[PDB]
Amino acid sequence: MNGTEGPNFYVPFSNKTGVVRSPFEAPQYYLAEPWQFSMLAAYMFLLIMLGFPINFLTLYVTVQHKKLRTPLNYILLNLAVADLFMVFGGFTTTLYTSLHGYFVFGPTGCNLEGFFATLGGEIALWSLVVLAIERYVVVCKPMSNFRFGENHAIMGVAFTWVMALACAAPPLVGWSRYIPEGMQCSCGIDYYTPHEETNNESFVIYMFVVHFIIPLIVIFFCYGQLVFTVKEAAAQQQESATTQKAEKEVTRMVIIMVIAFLICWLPYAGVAFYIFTHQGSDFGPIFMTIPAFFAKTSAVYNPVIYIMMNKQFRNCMVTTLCCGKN
Amino acid sequence: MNGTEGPNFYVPFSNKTGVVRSPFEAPQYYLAEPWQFSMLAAYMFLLIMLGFPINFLTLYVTVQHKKLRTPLNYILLNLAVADLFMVFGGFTTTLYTSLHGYFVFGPTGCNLEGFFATLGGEIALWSLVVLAIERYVVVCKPMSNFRFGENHAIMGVAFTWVMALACAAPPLVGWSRYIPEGMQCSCGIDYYTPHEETNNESFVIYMFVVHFIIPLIVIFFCYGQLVFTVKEAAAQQQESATTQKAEKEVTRMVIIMVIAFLICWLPYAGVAFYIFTHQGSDFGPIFMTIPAFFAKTSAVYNPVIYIMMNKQFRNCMVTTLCCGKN
């Protein structure tokens, strides 16, 4: 056996040598060199120094530039908020713990951090999903006489919140659980311990099916159609140089978006399904943190992709940062 | 006394408790907590993750886009290269070094690192100076029948190399010295030890005068004139919105450039001149590390300012990064 189990945790290292300590009570320098904890920190620091300004600037610029304030932009605001939760609930906490070498805030800290950290990543996720439903809806016009507006934009955000609660909340109250992962400095869902008094199994399938497969299907279908509709319309207006250009652009973007959504969750889900099929073969603390690296670094690239890459917002950003105009 | 001397170094901590060890042989965790060392690393990691791509992209995109390859841009290429020397000669080695807690490469490692780190920052600075001489020369047209071209462009680059050798070289062979600074992880010129078998004094004056004042004076004069000339021409052509716009814009930049230049060296020279006046009053390992922060972080902002900020290169960058077109 490659792990050593505690009542609130699973350190992925073997206590045959008796050196394993609780991830809530003492440094874990036996499962990773302290220089590696330093890099854990360097990484969290990078995520903050980029993530905060990128996601903050986004809210701030909307507050200043009124054309950015469409109902169809609401969900992108939602995205930046959720990215911020990821920063202040997850990244900073981890910065602080990595530098101690273990999770210095104990079980409740574990829950708090784990909750807000997954709440964020999940709102962000379903934001990307809602965005597509919305875009599809307004472009493919799947409804007789329908005009997307504020009320819709809203329900959409609320939906984003209800999904994420249906994901982060249950561990707190009996279904699955939160525990330190990988190097034990940050806390997340436990998808690698047949912990029965909590049904970690039914939950991971639930998580897999409802919070990965579905989102992935919905996204692909919506953007799939949207690209169809657009290429179908263009083909019918080949005399319009601009339209052909808009068509090219839209496609390139959908591709970038889908590839991005994959690069961010596939890894997490690949590891999960693997483990679920490969019962508790020692998974390096380091290895456990690869599904996590990809997902977390999204809080910087999502905003770059879905916001920074829009001639409009981009224009405002300039004005704002440049003391008024330019 | 707050220091402790050694044949090749000066630890800014007092050996009254006998805990001070050489910065070439053991961690300095008595003059800074380890997490602060980690944080040093975090910062070096940020400098690299931003500094390398920004400066590399700049070379790569030139190689790809014919328009950027004009003789007035040569010096901006020089700038990127200098920046890279800073990133590899300095930043990477400090990443490695900081995670050990001391300068694990010893004396001549000290000299090597010190040399390339200095060579970098200096070539960069004089690059900035030359750029102003050049822009002033073509815009203010101070000469009878002159046309700036390749030859000149080059003179300029050669010139930045000679000025930088004239600054990084001497400390290798008698004049001043290199030694671990601040937290003892990086090596730099010794401008805070009356070390006399090396005339640390005269060299600091020579540095203050010839590698700060002069640059300062040239830059202000050159851009002063340029802004003058441009504002004079516009006043004589108020008929043309474009012109008023260019004028407004040229000025904004010149300000930004000058302010940028100050933010980068004033602190270094502010601390220098002070110590030259305030004899070995204990400057913590931290204190002395701020003149270095402002300078080092320039390897990132210089390129954003002097390169990223021109709509042209910016366009190429897009094309390049976007796999050919867009």
Ligand SMILES: *[C@@H]1O[C@H](CO)[C@@H](O[C@@H]2O[C@H](CO)[C@@H](O[C@@H]3O[C@H](CO)[C@@H](O)[C@H](O[C@@H]4O[C@H](CO)[C@@H](O)[C@H](O)[C@@H]4O)[C@@H]3O)[C@H](O)[C@H]2NC(C)=O)[C@H](O)[C@H]1NC(C)=O
């Ligand atoms: C990884 O493996 C380690 C070795 O098995 C283990 O560490 C040991 O944990 C036990 C407690 O469960 C420690 O027991 C204490 O021993 C010291 C004396 O050396 C005392 O502080 C104390 O003695 C007392 O004994 C009394 C009568 O039995 C008892 O009533 C008192 O409450 C008190 O316990 C303990 O007996 C032992 O020292 C630890 N050894 C080492 C090497 O640290 C780790 O817990 C294990 N890691 C995990 C994650 O479980």
Ligand SMILES: *[C@@H]1O[C@H](CO)[C@@H](O[C@@H]2O[C@H](CO)[C@@H](O[C@@H]3O[C@H](CO)[C@@H](O)[C@H](O[C@@H]4O[C@H](CO)[C@@H](O)[C@H](O)[C@@H]4O)[C@@H]3O)[C@H](O)[C@H]2NC(C)=O)[C@H](O)[C@H]1NC(C)=O
């Ligand atoms: C900060 O302050 C520390 C205390 O002053 C100082 O550390 C001492 O450094 C000296 C060497 O200059 C060490 O001397 C050795 O002592 C040990 C035994 O305790 C032996 O390794 C060795 O014994 C012998 O001594 C004889 C010389 O008279 C002779 O037989 C051999 O040469 C052999 O060395 C040394 O004497 C001393 O142990 C150190 N103690 C501590 C606390 O480290 C640091 O150098 C100082 N840092 C500075 C000033 O740079």
Ligand SMILES: *[C@@H]1O[C@H](CO)[C@@H](O[C@@H]2O[C@H](CO)[C@@H](O)[C@H](O)[C@H]2NC(C)=O)[C@H](O)[C@H]1NC(C)=O
């Ligand atoms: C401890 O680690 C090893 C992996 O290195 C695990 O050993 C595996 O055992 C299963 C038997 O069910 C085999 O399928 C694998 O081939 C074994 N791996 C090796 C080394 O060949 C072991 O499972 C781990 N301990 C546990 C189960 O916690």
Ligand SMILES: *[C@@H]1O[C@H](CO)[C@@H](O[C@@H]2O[C@H](CO)[C@@H](O)[C@H](O)[C@H]2NC(C)=O)[C@H](O)[C@H]1NC(C)=O
């Ligand atoms: C170590 O620190 C002390 C005090 O910090 C230094 O003495 C200072 O000397 C100045 C000017 O001579 C006095 O005005 C102050 O009383 C001292 N500093 C302060 C702020 O109180 C002393 O010189 C230091 N040791 C060394 C290496 O010189």
Ligand SMILES: CCCCCCCCO[C@@H]1[C@@H](O)[C@H](O)[C@@H](CO)O[C@H]1O
């Ligand atoms: C750690 C010993 C001091 C020298 C460090 C040189 C870099 C080592 O680099 C590797 C890491 O990349 C790898 O992640 C771990 C296994 O998790 O093993 C280390 O030796």
Ligand SMILES: CCCCCCCCO[C@@H]1[C@@H](O)[C@H](O)[C@@H](CO)O[C@H]1O
């Ligand atoms: C961004 C700022 C983060 C600050 C992190 C501080 C971590 C300090 O962590 C140390 C322990 O690792 C050390 O062993 C004990 C000494 O008993 O003291 C603590 O403060």
Ligand SMILES: CCCCCCCCO[C@@H]1[C@@H](O)[C@H](O)[C@@H](CO)O[C@H]1O
């Ligand atoms: C997967 C959900 C949306 C992804 C759909 C993208 C399909 C790309 O569609 C491709 C275009 O990318 C390509 O430019 C032309 C050229 O012949 O051929 C199309 O079929």
Ligand SMILES: CCCCCCCCO[C@@H]1[C@@H](O)[C@H](O)[C@@H](CO)O[C@H]1O
């Ligand atoms: C990525 C850059 C690699 C840096 C690796 C840092 C190696 C420092 O590793 C040191 C050892 O060299 C030292 O012997 C012990 C003291 O008990 O402490 C360790 O942390």
Ligand SMILES: CCCCCCCCO[C@@H]1[C@@H](O)[C@H](O)[C@H](CO)O[C@H]1O
């Ligand atoms: C790069 C290393 C510096 C990191 C930021 C410093 C935070 C300041 O906070 C610490 C204090 O807690 C410590 O007691 C002393 C203060 O005198 O050193 C400072 O750096």
Ligand SMILES: *C(=O)CCCCCCCCCCCCCCC
């Ligand atoms: C053209 O549109 C194709 C490229 C544009 C896609 C956006 C790529 C930028 C992503 C930045 C993510 C940085 C995160 C840090 C991890 C390396």
Ligand SMILES: *C(=O)CCCCCCCCCCCCCCC
């Ligand atoms: C409009 O242009 C007014 C603002 C001027 C823009 C110049 C500021 C760019 C700063 C980038 C440097 C960031 C350094 C990061 C620290 C490591």
